Amino acid sequence: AVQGLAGHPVTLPCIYSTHLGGIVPMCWGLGECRHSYCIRSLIWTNGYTVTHQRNSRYQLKGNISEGNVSLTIENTVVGDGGPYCCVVEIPGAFHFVDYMLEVKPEL
């Protein structure tokens, strides 16, 4: 489980090769990948920029068009803990990443 600290940002890595996958859309969602995928969406990109976001705390601060679609959750709270899913819609070879985030109250 990725460890986070309340009051600080936390980043969940999600990266893919655009050389082999092309520049494609991706989404982040709350929940485990096989039970929700992106039904409870946090982020949607069109491959180049974020086109949908649940709220401003969910940011893609990396170079999106170069494959870095890692999610940074700003100003985390213990309540942000839980499962997260990244889905990169690479035609014919979707990439999935499951994370269990644990944000500690202090430390």
Read off the CATH number of the domain in which 59 is found: 2.60.40.10
d(CA 107, CA 93): 40
Cα–Cα distance for residue pair 47/78, rounded to 1 Å: 31
Parent domain of 82: 1-107
DSSP alpha helices (H): ranges in the chain? 18-21, 33-36
CA distance 103 to 90: 30
Method: X-ray
Domains of the chain: total: 1
